[PDB]
Amino acid sequence: MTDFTPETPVLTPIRDHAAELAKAEAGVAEMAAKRNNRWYPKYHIASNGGWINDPNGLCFYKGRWHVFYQLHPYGTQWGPMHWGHVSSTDMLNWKREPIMFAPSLEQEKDGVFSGSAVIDDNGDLRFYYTGHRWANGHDNTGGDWQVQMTALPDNDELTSATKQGMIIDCPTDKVDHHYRDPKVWKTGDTWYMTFGVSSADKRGQMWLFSSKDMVRWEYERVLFQHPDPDVFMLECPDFSPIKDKDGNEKWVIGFSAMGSKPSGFMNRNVSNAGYMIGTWEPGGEFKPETEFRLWDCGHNYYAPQSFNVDGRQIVYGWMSPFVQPIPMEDDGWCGQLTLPREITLGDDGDVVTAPVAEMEGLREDTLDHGSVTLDMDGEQIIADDAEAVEIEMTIDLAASTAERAGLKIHATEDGAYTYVAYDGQIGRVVVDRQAMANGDRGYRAAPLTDAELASGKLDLRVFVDRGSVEVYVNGGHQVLSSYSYASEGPRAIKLVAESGSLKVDSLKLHHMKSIGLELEHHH
Amino acid sequence: MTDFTPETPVLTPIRDHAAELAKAEAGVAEMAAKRNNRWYPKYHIASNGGWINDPNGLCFYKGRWHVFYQLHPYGTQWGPMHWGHVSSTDMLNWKREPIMFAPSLEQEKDGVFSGSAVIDDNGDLRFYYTGHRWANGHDNTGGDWQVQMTALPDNDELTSATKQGMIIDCPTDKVDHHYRDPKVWKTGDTWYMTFGVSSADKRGQMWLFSSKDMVRWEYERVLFQHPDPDVFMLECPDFSPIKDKDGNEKWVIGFSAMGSKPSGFMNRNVSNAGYMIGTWEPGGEFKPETEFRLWDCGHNYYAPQSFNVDGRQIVYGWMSPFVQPIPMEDDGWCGQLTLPREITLGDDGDVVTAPVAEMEGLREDTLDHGSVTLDMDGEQIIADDAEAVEIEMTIDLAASTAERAGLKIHATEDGAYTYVAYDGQIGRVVVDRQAMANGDRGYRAAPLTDAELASGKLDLRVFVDRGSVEVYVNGGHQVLSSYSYASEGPRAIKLVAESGSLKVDSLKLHHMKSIGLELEHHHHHH
Ligand SMILES: [Cl-]
Ligand SMILES: [Cl-]
Ligand SMILES: [Cl-]
Ligand SMILES: [Cl-]
Ligand SMILES: [Cl-]
Ligand SMILES: [Cl-]
């Protein structure tokens, strides 16, 4: 009826969903068949073929972990949006599932955009997602035209769903196009949805709705507007309560912000995700108590989604390749997710995102190097050939006189490498790709607080996969995720000290198992 | 000892200077004969053999430019100090002169330390230099024992000089050993002297003496005390008036400071030389109007000395290797000077040190690339084997989206290189040695002001020599000088853009001429 919030869903089939699924399966299979594994992850989620982006429909349900993701089943760049799907009983051994969604309704005809999953009062899962149309009916040049949809699984395995159609329409004149990425949750006795919006005045907002049956929605208010007028859109919003060190609940608002200008080491990527911590009276505005901070300070990270399982809030991000050249796109796939992280609040009151505990189960072994000291400028080989490894190290900052020091990873015979370092001139942990022979380069620098610098010790937990590095700083107080497209031959890891000494109190290497998604793998 | 300024110089010969000089000449010629030239400069002043340090006795005198330097004629580490000497009519073609000074007087018996040369009221040159003894008669554990000495040239070509002896003794009760590096100049009717002192309370100071005849000196006051208590000593002090284009003079005090702790990008080297700008009325104390700023932001630069000729103030620095490993020391030499730079004041009132204009005469050719665009992250090859070259480039900061961009030099087949880059996250120009296969590494970052960063353009003039790089930013507003010990094989130069585009409005390469100091008859190119 043009009520922005229809009283019952608007279901408008226009394509055979089974046949569209079958065509998507074929597209993925053509790319998987010719895939080059040189940079393909051994222990991160990627499509078996094609481009992926945002994680979606994240849940634990009926005895399995489920990860869905935005998928272009016909090439290795972004294109008509589908949802792909992997599942696991343990977060360690994963299986590929049928493609879940292809566009089949009028309001999503140009893409099945990002969405989430939530378990209702009866223990039944519901999906919420955005349906995308080109505003001009053609291509991106006239902008987006977006609405919110819902669907219900057909089975406990979540291998297929019945779509129910549009539940929240777009009031065209109140929005500047962008209108997407829903999250639904229950607080007290009321169900709430939020999603991202660009206002009529082009400000990034999260809107709030409420529902009693999860299907018919009512507009409540604007939950949050981003204080920087350069920020015009908040994609992939997140909102959840997290227990602080005193046992009090804080609300952590999250989004993937479009429009910020880079400043110093902050907001360096094309778009940038992060958080603020604050308070919320249910039904009211979010009241921030902190300035914006990045979820991840690395080169390649965006669109994180979080979900709750038995009191734990767990988050995946997409490692987003927004900058040319992207050489993995020649290899029949593009895009992986980060490892799953747990969102906690540390003793200093700030968000901490350590890997979930289950990730310890990736370790095949432990090579304990003990304490290592470099007395002056130099290097030591820690590994002659590391395809997929985790390094844990603690550096004694107070004793080490090196100006910069850390690990060169993917250090190949042509002299290329990616450098994970503490840099003492700036008091930050960097990932620096200047010497890489493939992909775009640059560096990214994660902040250390005065207390972290005064502590005298610095912990790094570094996950190297075939095409990527993730650096967890001080137990995931900060994280930097970045692609690292190793050159050919053996891929060394080297401990490095520049212009002074380096005292490493503890250094351990673990080889990483496969999560079973690459299938049979060679060497 | 309140007469620590003798009415007449104290001359105490203890060795035969001519025989000591002859021994030093043999030391240097033997190192030169075996020298390895892989990192040896083509167009910077080094010893032909042995270690050097501070530039000394700089002047233009009787039609010639003269450069002397601290020299250890018997090895490639610091050792018994001598003065070596090179001269030229044109700053482009230099001639190796005889060693000028060897230790031969009581008060300098453990070394002829640093010093300067000034032209007196009659137009005759006079040398002033510090004589060194160990306080404990044998080594450094007892610290230094230092006094000021003077000497006169024997001929207009300064091929030799006659020592006169000590003119200023050390009131050892008042000073904590350090007492060195004199500079003499005239203001008004009066001659002044300054040198560096560590006070009794271990504060770095510069003292001011006066004279009307240049040989008899009189204590006036402490000219300056370093406001950072960590700084115990101010070596190689400089003090000179610099004109703006506005017709005012400012006094620029300079010092090579010991004791400062590193902080952020500032004061990163073992010791660090820099300046303050302010005012001075003759006889009074220096009044600083600026905070301390580095002369040179690079890895390897210390002990600058400047001199005045015809309204120009010209400065050389020693490229100081303070940090292990120092690979050139295995090659029969160690250390080189920077190119000569002119001190001026720029539009913001800060010191600028461009290369002197005579350095244009080093260019053998010009390979003009015109404007060059990288549309995205990438590299273009500028040279495949650049031994000694100058690259001039103007970056269009307004149009370049690259996060970091510039030149990789000494870029060898093993993947090693030294990177000279504008870094847009820190708003600085860096020299980063992280990828070098020889020498200590790390990076140095020279500041750019808010006005420079909002300029549409950034100028870089980069001199690569066999073992070094010097990067002159925005016409010398900042400079970075750093050793870069290239690996073997062809040494490429690459233009680099990271993570965005790079628009270069002009890019030119010039091959550099030899300055004629690398000549060695045992080395047969052949
Ligand atoms: Cl920051
Ligand atoms: Cl491995
Ligand atoms: Cl490869
Ligand atoms: Cl600084
Ligand atoms: Cl060439
Ligand atoms: Cl050359």
Short mmCIF file of N, CA and C in Angstrom, two decimals, chain A residues 59-198:
data_model
loop_
_atom_site.label_atom_id
_atom_site.label_comp_id
_atom_site.label_asym_id
_atom_site.label_seq_id
_atom_site.Cartn_x
_atom_site.Cartn_y
_atom_site.Cartn_z
N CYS A 59 25.77 -17.71 11.91
CA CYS A 59 25.09 -18.30 13.08
C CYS A 59 25.73 -19.62 13.53
N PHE A 60 25.30 -20.07 14.72
CA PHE A 60 25.44 -21.47 15.08
C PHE A 60 24.01 -21.99 15.22
N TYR A 61 23.69 -23.09 14.53
CA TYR A 61 22.28 -23.52 14.51
C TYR A 61 22.17 -25.01 14.28
N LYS A 62 21.36 -25.67 15.12
CA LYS A 62 21.11 -27.13 15.03
C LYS A 62 22.44 -27.93 14.90
N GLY A 63 23.43 -27.53 15.72
CA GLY A 63 24.65 -28.32 15.89
C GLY A 63 25.76 -27.94 14.91
N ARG A 64 25.54 -26.94 14.06
CA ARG A 64 26.60 -26.47 13.15
C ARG A 64 26.86 -24.96 13.15
N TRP A 65 28.11 -24.60 12.88
CA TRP A 65 28.52 -23.25 12.55
C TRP A 65 28.19 -23.05 11.08
N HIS A 66 27.61 -21.91 10.75
CA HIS A 66 27.30 -21.58 9.35
C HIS A 66 27.87 -20.24 8.98
N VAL A 67 28.55 -20.22 7.83
CA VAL A 67 29.00 -18.98 7.27
C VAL A 67 28.44 -18.88 5.82
N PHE A 68 27.72 -17.80 5.54
CA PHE A 68 27.30 -17.51 4.16
C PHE A 68 28.13 -16.30 3.75
N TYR A 69 28.09 -15.94 2.46
CA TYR A 69 28.88 -14.79 2.00
C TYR A 69 28.34 -14.32 0.64
N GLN A 70 28.48 -13.02 0.42
CA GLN A 70 28.16 -12.42 -0.88
C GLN A 70 29.08 -13.08 -1.89
N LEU A 71 28.54 -13.47 -3.04
CA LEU A 71 29.26 -14.32 -4.03
C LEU A 71 28.91 -13.85 -5.43
N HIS A 72 29.91 -13.68 -6.29
CA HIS A 72 29.62 -13.52 -7.71
C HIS A 72 30.01 -14.82 -8.35
N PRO A 73 29.00 -15.60 -8.77
CA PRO A 73 29.32 -16.95 -9.25
C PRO A 73 29.86 -17.04 -10.70
N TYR A 74 30.03 -15.91 -11.39
CA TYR A 74 30.39 -15.86 -12.83
C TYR A 74 31.73 -15.19 -13.16
N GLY A 75 32.43 -14.73 -12.14
CA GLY A 75 33.78 -14.17 -12.37
C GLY A 75 34.44 -13.80 -11.05
N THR A 76 35.64 -13.21 -11.16
CA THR A 76 36.49 -12.90 -10.01
C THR A 76 36.53 -11.42 -9.66
N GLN A 77 35.63 -10.66 -10.26
CA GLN A 77 35.30 -9.33 -9.82
C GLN A 77 33.86 -9.31 -9.30
N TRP A 78 33.44 -8.14 -8.79
CA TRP A 78 32.12 -8.02 -8.18
C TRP A 78 31.06 -8.12 -9.29
N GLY A 79 29.90 -8.75 -9.04
CA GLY A 79 28.88 -8.82 -10.11
C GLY A 79 27.63 -9.34 -9.45
N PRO A 80 26.60 -9.77 -10.22
CA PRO A 80 25.30 -10.18 -9.65
C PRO A 80 25.35 -11.03 -8.37
N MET A 81 24.80 -10.47 -7.32
CA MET A 81 25.05 -10.99 -5.96
C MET A 81 24.20 -12.23 -5.63
N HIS A 82 24.90 -13.27 -5.17
CA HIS A 82 24.30 -14.50 -4.66
C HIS A 82 24.80 -14.71 -3.20
N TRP A 83 24.21 -15.64 -2.46
CA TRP A 83 24.87 -16.10 -1.20
C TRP A 83 25.47 -17.50 -1.36
N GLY A 84 26.77 -17.62 -1.05
CA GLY A 84 27.43 -18.94 -0.95
C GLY A 84 27.34 -19.38 0.50
N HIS A 85 27.81 -20.59 0.80
CA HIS A 85 27.59 -21.25 2.13
C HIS A 85 28.57 -22.40 2.38
N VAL A 86 29.16 -22.34 3.58
CA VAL A 86 30.01 -23.37 4.17
C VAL A 86 29.51 -23.65 5.60
N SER A 87 29.69 -24.89 6.05
CA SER A 87 29.26 -25.21 7.39
C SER A 87 30.33 -26.10 8.05
N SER A 88 30.23 -26.24 9.37
CA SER A 88 31.20 -26.97 10.18
C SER A 88 30.62 -27.41 11.53
N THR A 89 30.98 -28.59 12.01
CA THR A 89 30.52 -28.95 13.38
C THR A 89 31.48 -28.43 14.44
N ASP A 90 32.64 -27.90 14.02
CA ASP A 90 33.70 -27.59 15.01
C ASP A 90 34.53 -26.31 14.82
N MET A 91 34.26 -25.63 13.73
CA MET A 91 35.01 -24.46 13.24
C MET A 91 36.38 -24.81 12.69
N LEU A 92 36.66 -26.11 12.58
CA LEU A 92 38.01 -26.56 12.15
C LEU A 92 37.92 -27.30 10.82
N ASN A 93 36.85 -28.06 10.61
CA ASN A 93 36.70 -28.87 9.39
C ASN A 93 35.41 -28.36 8.74
N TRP A 94 35.54 -27.79 7.55
CA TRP A 94 34.42 -27.14 6.92
C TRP A 94 34.03 -27.89 5.65
N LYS A 95 32.75 -27.78 5.30
CA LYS A 95 32.27 -28.33 4.06
C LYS A 95 31.56 -27.30 3.23
N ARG A 96 31.67 -27.43 1.91
CA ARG A 96 30.97 -26.52 1.02
C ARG A 96 29.50 -26.98 0.91
N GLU A 97 28.58 -26.00 0.91
CA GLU A 97 27.15 -26.27 0.83
C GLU A 97 26.64 -25.75 -0.50
N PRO A 98 25.41 -26.14 -0.89
CA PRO A 98 24.84 -25.52 -2.08
C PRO A 98 24.80 -24.01 -1.97
N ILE A 99 24.95 -23.32 -3.11
CA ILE A 99 24.68 -21.88 -3.14
C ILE A 99 23.25 -21.70 -2.59
N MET A 100 23.06 -20.68 -1.77
CA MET A 100 21.85 -20.58 -0.94
C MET A 100 20.80 -19.73 -1.63
N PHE A 101 21.22 -18.56 -2.11
CA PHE A 101 20.31 -17.59 -2.73
C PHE A 101 20.83 -17.10 -4.08
N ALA A 102 19.94 -16.98 -5.07
CA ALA A 102 20.20 -16.33 -6.33
C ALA A 102 19.05 -15.33 -6.46
N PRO A 103 19.24 -14.24 -7.22
CA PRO A 103 18.12 -13.31 -7.37
C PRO A 103 16.90 -13.94 -8.05
N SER A 104 15.73 -13.83 -7.43
CA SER A 104 14.53 -14.45 -8.03
C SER A 104 13.24 -13.67 -7.81
N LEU A 105 13.31 -12.58 -7.02
CA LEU A 105 12.18 -11.74 -6.75
C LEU A 105 12.43 -10.38 -7.33
N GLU A 106 11.35 -9.66 -7.64
CA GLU A 106 11.50 -8.36 -8.35
C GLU A 106 12.39 -7.38 -7.57
N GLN A 107 12.27 -7.35 -6.24
CA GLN A 107 12.95 -6.33 -5.44
C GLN A 107 14.45 -6.65 -5.19
N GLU A 108 14.90 -7.85 -5.59
CA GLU A 108 16.29 -8.24 -5.46
C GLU A 108 16.84 -8.62 -6.83
N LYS A 109 16.13 -8.25 -7.90
CA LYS A 109 16.46 -8.83 -9.21
C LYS A 109 17.89 -8.55 -9.69
N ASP A 110 18.51 -7.48 -9.17
CA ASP A 110 19.89 -7.13 -9.53
C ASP A 110 20.90 -7.56 -8.45
N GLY A 111 20.45 -8.29 -7.42
CA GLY A 111 21.40 -8.88 -6.44
C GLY A 111 20.74 -9.20 -5.11
N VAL A 112 21.14 -10.34 -4.52
CA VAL A 112 20.78 -10.71 -3.14
C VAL A 112 21.94 -10.24 -2.27
N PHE A 113 21.70 -9.08 -1.65
CA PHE A 113 22.69 -8.33 -0.92
C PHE A 113 22.83 -8.88 0.50
N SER A 114 23.61 -8.20 1.32
CA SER A 114 24.04 -8.78 2.57
C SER A 114 22.87 -8.93 3.53
N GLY A 115 23.02 -9.80 4.52
CA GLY A 115 21.97 -10.09 5.47
C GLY A 115 22.54 -10.95 6.59
N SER A 116 21.67 -11.30 7.51
CA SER A 116 22.06 -11.97 8.73
C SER A 116 21.05 -13.05 9.09
N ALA A 117 21.36 -13.78 10.16
CA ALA A 117 20.47 -14.79 10.66
C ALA A 117 20.29 -14.64 12.14
N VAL A 118 19.09 -14.91 12.62
CA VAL A 118 18.83 -14.82 14.06
C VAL A 118 17.86 -15.92 14.44
N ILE A 119 17.98 -16.40 15.68
CA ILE A 119 17.15 -17.46 16.21
C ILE A 119 16.01 -16.85 17.01
N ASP A 120 14.79 -17.23 16.67
CA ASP A 120 13.65 -16.62 17.29
C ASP A 120 13.33 -17.25 18.63
N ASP A 121 12.27 -16.73 19.26
CA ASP A 121 11.83 -17.20 20.55
C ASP A 121 11.61 -18.71 20.65
N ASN A 122 11.21 -19.34 19.55
CA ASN A 122 10.97 -20.80 19.50
C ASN A 122 12.18 -21.65 19.12
N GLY A 123 13.35 -21.02 18.95
CA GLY A 123 14.54 -21.71 18.48
C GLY A 123 14.63 -21.91 16.97
N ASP A 124 13.79 -21.22 16.23
CA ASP A 124 13.79 -21.31 14.74
C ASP A 124 14.57 -20.19 14.10
N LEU A 125 15.42 -20.50 13.12
CA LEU A 125 16.21 -19.45 12.45
C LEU A 125 15.37 -18.67 11.41
N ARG A 126 15.60 -17.36 11.32
CA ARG A 126 15.10 -16.49 10.28
C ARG A 126 16.24 -15.72 9.64
N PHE A 127 16.21 -15.56 8.29
CA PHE A 127 17.15 -14.74 7.57
C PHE A 127 16.53 -13.36 7.25
N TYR A 128 17.36 -12.33 7.31
CA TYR A 128 17.03 -10.98 6.88
C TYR A 128 18.11 -10.52 5.92
N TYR A 129 17.73 -9.96 4.76
CA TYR A 129 18.73 -9.53 3.80
C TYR A 129 18.20 -8.36 2.94
N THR A 130 19.10 -7.72 2.21
CA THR A 130 18.67 -6.62 1.36
C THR A 130 18.49 -7.07 -0.05
N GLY A 131 17.38 -6.67 -0.68
CA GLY A 131 17.24 -6.92 -2.13
C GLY A 131 17.68 -5.69 -2.92
N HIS A 132 18.51 -5.89 -3.94
CA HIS A 132 19.06 -4.80 -4.68
C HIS A 132 18.48 -4.75 -6.10
N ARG A 133 18.17 -3.55 -6.51
CA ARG A 133 17.78 -3.16 -7.85
C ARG A 133 18.65 -2.00 -8.25
N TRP A 134 19.06 -1.94 -9.51
CA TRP A 134 19.62 -0.69 -10.04
C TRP A 134 18.51 0.36 -10.10
N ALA A 135 18.72 1.53 -9.48
CA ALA A 135 17.76 2.63 -9.52
C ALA A 135 17.33 3.04 -10.93
N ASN A 136 18.22 2.93 -11.92
CA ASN A 136 17.86 3.34 -13.28
C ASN A 136 17.42 2.12 -14.10
N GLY A 137 17.43 0.94 -13.48
CA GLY A 137 17.02 -0.29 -14.20
C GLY A 137 18.18 -0.93 -14.95
N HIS A 138 19.34 -0.29 -14.93
CA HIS A 138 20.47 -0.78 -15.75
C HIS A 138 21.74 -1.15 -15.07
N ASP A 139 22.38 -0.18 -14.45
CA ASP A 139 23.75 -0.33 -14.03
C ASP A 139 23.90 0.64 -12.90
N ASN A 140 25.13 0.73 -12.39
CA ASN A 140 25.43 1.46 -11.18
C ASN A 140 25.31 2.96 -11.34
N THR A 141 25.34 3.43 -12.59
CA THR A 141 25.46 4.87 -12.86
C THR A 141 24.32 5.76 -12.31
N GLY A 142 23.13 5.20 -12.12
CA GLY A 142 22.04 5.96 -11.45
C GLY A 142 21.83 5.58 -9.97
N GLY A 143 22.75 4.80 -9.43
CA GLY A 143 22.68 4.50 -8.00
C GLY A 143 21.91 3.22 -7.68
N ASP A 144 21.66 3.04 -6.37
CA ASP A 144 21.11 1.81 -5.82
C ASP A 144 19.63 2.07 -5.49
N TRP A 145 18.85 0.99 -5.45
CA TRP A 145 17.46 1.00 -5.05
C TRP A 145 17.27 -0.30 -4.23
N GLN A 146 17.11 -0.13 -2.91
CA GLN A 146 17.27 -1.22 -1.94
C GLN A 146 16.15 -1.30 -0.95
N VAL A 147 15.76 -2.53 -0.59
CA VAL A 147 14.68 -2.76 0.40
C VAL A 147 15.06 -3.96 1.27
N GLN A 148 14.32 -4.22 2.36
CA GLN A 148 14.67 -5.36 3.21
C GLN A 148 13.69 -6.51 3.04
N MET A 149 14.26 -7.70 3.02
CA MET A 149 13.56 -8.97 2.74
C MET A 149 13.75 -9.96 3.90
N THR A 150 12.96 -11.05 3.89
CA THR A 150 13.13 -12.10 4.88
C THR A 150 12.86 -13.48 4.22
N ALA A 151 13.43 -14.52 4.81
CA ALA A 151 13.32 -15.89 4.35
C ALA A 151 13.51 -16.83 5.53
N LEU A 152 13.03 -18.06 5.36
CA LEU A 152 13.08 -19.06 6.42
C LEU A 152 13.71 -20.32 5.85
N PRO A 153 14.61 -20.96 6.60
CA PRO A 153 15.21 -22.20 6.09
C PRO A 153 14.17 -23.27 5.87
N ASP A 154 14.41 -24.12 4.87
CA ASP A 154 13.55 -25.29 4.68
C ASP A 154 13.93 -26.52 5.52
N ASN A 155 15.15 -26.51 6.06
CA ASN A 155 15.64 -27.70 6.77
C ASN A 155 16.69 -27.28 7.79
N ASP A 156 17.00 -28.19 8.71
CA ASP A 156 17.95 -27.85 9.80
C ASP A 156 19.38 -27.65 9.29
N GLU A 157 19.67 -28.19 8.09
CA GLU A 157 21.01 -28.09 7.48
C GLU A 157 21.25 -26.72 6.83
N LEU A 158 20.17 -25.94 6.73
CA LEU A 158 20.15 -24.63 6.03
C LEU A 158 20.64 -24.74 4.58
N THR A 159 20.30 -25.83 3.89
CA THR A 159 20.80 -25.99 2.53
C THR A 159 19.88 -25.30 1.49
N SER A 160 18.70 -24.93 1.92
CA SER A 160 17.76 -24.16 1.07
C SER A 160 16.80 -23.40 2.01
N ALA A 161 16.14 -22.39 1.46
CA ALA A 161 15.21 -21.51 2.17
C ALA A 161 13.98 -21.16 1.32
N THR A 162 12.88 -20.82 1.99
CA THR A 162 11.71 -20.28 1.33
C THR A 162 11.72 -18.76 1.61
N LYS A 163 11.72 -18.00 0.53
CA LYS A 163 11.72 -16.55 0.63
C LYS A 163 10.33 -16.10 0.92
N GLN A 164 10.21 -15.03 1.67
CA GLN A 164 8.88 -14.57 1.99
C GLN A 164 8.62 -13.19 1.41
N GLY A 165 9.65 -12.53 0.86
CA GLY A 165 9.50 -11.24 0.17
C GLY A 165 9.92 -10.02 1.00
N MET A 166 9.47 -8.86 0.55
CA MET A 166 9.90 -7.59 1.09
C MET A 166 9.10 -7.28 2.38
N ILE A 167 9.80 -6.90 3.45
CA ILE A 167 9.13 -6.55 4.73
C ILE A 167 9.33 -5.06 5.04
N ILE A 168 10.35 -4.46 4.48
CA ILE A 168 10.54 -2.98 4.72
C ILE A 168 10.91 -2.33 3.38
N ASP A 169 10.03 -1.46 2.87
CA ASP A 169 10.25 -0.80 1.61
C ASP A 169 11.10 0.45 1.85
N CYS A 170 11.51 1.09 0.78
CA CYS A 170 12.33 2.28 0.88
C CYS A 170 11.49 3.53 0.62
N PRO A 171 11.41 4.49 1.60
CA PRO A 171 10.76 5.78 1.28
C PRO A 171 11.74 6.67 0.51
N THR A 172 11.61 6.60 -0.81
CA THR A 172 12.54 7.15 -1.79
C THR A 172 12.98 8.57 -1.45
N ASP A 173 12.04 9.38 -1.01
CA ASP A 173 12.35 10.82 -0.89
C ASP A 173 13.08 11.13 0.41
N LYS A 174 13.12 10.16 1.31
CA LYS A 174 13.80 10.36 2.61
C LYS A 174 15.20 9.75 2.60
N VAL A 175 15.56 9.09 1.51
CA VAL A 175 16.83 8.33 1.45
C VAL A 175 17.59 8.81 0.23
N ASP A 176 18.91 8.95 0.33
CA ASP A 176 19.70 9.07 -0.88
C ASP A 176 20.25 7.70 -1.37
N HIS A 177 19.34 6.83 -1.83
CA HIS A 177 19.67 5.51 -2.49
C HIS A 177 20.08 4.39 -1.52
N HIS A 178 21.21 4.57 -0.86
CA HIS A 178 21.73 3.57 0.08
C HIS A 178 20.77 3.19 1.23
N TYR A 179 20.46 1.90 1.33
CA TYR A 179 19.42 1.47 2.27
C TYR A 179 19.55 -0.03 2.50
N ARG A 180 20.47 -0.49 3.38
CA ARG A 180 20.84 -1.88 3.27
C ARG A 180 21.49 -2.45 4.54
N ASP A 181 21.51 -3.79 4.60
CA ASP A 181 22.39 -4.58 5.52
C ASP A 181 21.76 -4.70 6.91
N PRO A 182 20.67 -5.51 7.02
CA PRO A 182 19.93 -5.55 8.29
C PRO A 182 20.53 -6.46 9.39
N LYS A 183 20.30 -6.06 10.64
CA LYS A 183 20.63 -6.89 11.79
C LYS A 183 19.41 -6.88 12.68
N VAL A 184 18.99 -8.05 13.14
CA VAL A 184 17.76 -8.13 14.00
C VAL A 184 18.14 -8.80 15.34
N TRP A 185 17.64 -8.28 16.44
CA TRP A 185 17.97 -8.90 17.73
C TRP A 185 16.84 -8.57 18.70
N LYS A 186 16.85 -9.29 19.83
CA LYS A 186 15.87 -9.05 20.89
C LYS A 186 16.52 -8.45 22.13
N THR A 187 15.95 -7.34 22.61
CA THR A 187 16.32 -6.74 23.90
C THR A 187 15.04 -6.64 24.73
N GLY A 188 15.11 -7.14 25.96
CA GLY A 188 13.96 -7.21 26.84
C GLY A 188 12.91 -8.05 26.16
N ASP A 189 11.77 -7.45 25.93
CA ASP A 189 10.67 -8.16 25.36
C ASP A 189 10.37 -7.77 23.90
N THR A 190 11.29 -7.09 23.24
CA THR A 190 10.99 -6.46 21.97
C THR A 190 12.06 -6.85 20.97
N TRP A 191 11.65 -7.13 19.72
CA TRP A 191 12.59 -7.36 18.61
C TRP A 191 12.87 -6.03 17.88
N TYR A 192 14.13 -5.85 17.46
CA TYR A 192 14.60 -4.62 16.86
C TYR A 192 15.37 -5.03 15.62
N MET A 193 15.32 -4.15 14.62
CA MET A 193 16.16 -4.20 13.41
C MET A 193 16.89 -2.90 13.27
N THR A 194 18.14 -2.96 12.80
CA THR A 194 18.78 -1.78 12.34
C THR A 194 19.37 -2.10 10.97
N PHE A 195 19.47 -1.07 10.14
CA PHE A 195 20.25 -1.16 8.92
C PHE A 195 20.78 0.23 8.59
N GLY A 196 21.68 0.29 7.61
CA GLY A 196 22.33 1.51 7.20
C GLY A 196 21.58 2.28 6.14
N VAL A 197 21.69 3.61 6.22
CA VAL A 197 20.94 4.52 5.37
C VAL A 197 21.79 5.74 5.10
N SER A 198 21.67 6.27 3.89
CA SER A 198 22.15 7.63 3.60
C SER A 198 20.93 8.51 3.59
#
